[PDB]
Design a protein around this ligand. Sequence first.
Ligand SMILES: CC[n+]1c(-c2ccccc2)c2cc(N)ccc2c2ccc(N)cc21
Ligand SMILES: CC[n+]1c(-c2ccccc2)c2cc(N)ccc2c2ccc(N)cc21
Lengths: 184, 184
Amino acid sequence: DKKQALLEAATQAIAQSGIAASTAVIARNAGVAEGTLFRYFATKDELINTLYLHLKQDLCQSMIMELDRSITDAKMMTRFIWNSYISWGLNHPARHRAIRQLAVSEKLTKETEQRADDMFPELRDLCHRSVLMVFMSDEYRAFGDGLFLALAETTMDFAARDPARAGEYIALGFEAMWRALTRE
Amino acid sequence: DKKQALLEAATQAIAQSGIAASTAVIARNAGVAEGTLFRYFATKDELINTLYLHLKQDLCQSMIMELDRSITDAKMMTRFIWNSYISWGLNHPARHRAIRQLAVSEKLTKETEQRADDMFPELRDLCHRSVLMVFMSDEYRAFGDGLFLALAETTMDFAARDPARAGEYIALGFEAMWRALTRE
Ligand SMILES: CC[n+]1c(-c2ccccc2)c2cc(N)ccc2c2ccc(N)cc21
Ligand SMILES: CC[n+]1c(-c2ccccc2)c2cc(N)ccc2c2ccc(N)cc21
């Protein structure tokens, strides 16, 4: 079973505690010995990187299956992808909380971030077409990403607590994020 | 001293665990019995309301003391007030984390929100003059506030982590927030 068992327990622990979360707690909650966690994942940094790839691949798969390739307007394409992104976060709140904490942790390797980006080429090209050049720079990209993740999580939080207005929060959050991060 | 001790313990606890912070943990960390905490605040909600107003009064005093009335441009003024807001959060990171969790909690009374709203006349009027109608609305103001606090907290987090570019994060964060939340 057990590699999956370790990834799910790391998901919940990091959602709750961020990377400050406990390999003992993780291994325990996965029903295995801690030295066993380290046989599957040689280090904590490798568990963090591997977990991030697994969670991003699930999120990406979920967005890709909803992609209407007929749309070519950058704003309309980005909107329908945001809808999908927020939907996944509403369905998997711990999985999203874990991605956001790992993303901003600066414990992700350059190789990991590029492999994550390559999971959704159309979104990476959308970033290239649409995001302000300052937020695509090496110096401020991480901040751009942090602002995006803040806006997306706040949208998920308001939507999750008031389902009746969820579609409107999702629409208002998209328009706010688009004005915040894109070319004037 | 016991009430102030409970409010400082409550600040630290809610900064770390949100309104899910335990009243057992709060009281112990203040050096008092949970029973005594409920002598000062008969419900968890009354502690939330009182603590919110104490932290907002502190934040508002800090911004009012820094206000430069020589700044007659609405955007530049908003910007100088943003600078003071971020500066207060960098000086008091538990205070700003607690304010954000309390502000989005749905536990604040109508009367609490009204008292908060008229601690800073100049800001209230700038909000009325500048913010998009939808983020003033009874239905979506709370969401607008949540987006603002998410962008402000993210700006503080990046400035605190990478202090060599703090000024740049503060300026970029302001401009992104201004685009996200203000009128044509
Ligand atoms: C900040 C870029 N950005 C954009 C984006 C925003 C505006 C225009 C184009 C792309 C994005 C847009 C949608 N819908 C869904 C996810 C992402 C995304 C996800 C992760 C990340 N690190 C940056 C991301
Ligand atoms: C979202 C409104 N808004 C504005 C604001 C934003 C844009 C234009 C004018 C005012 C604001 C501006 C600065 N500098 C500092 C604090 C706040 C603020 C604080 C709390 C809140 N609940 C809304 C807030």
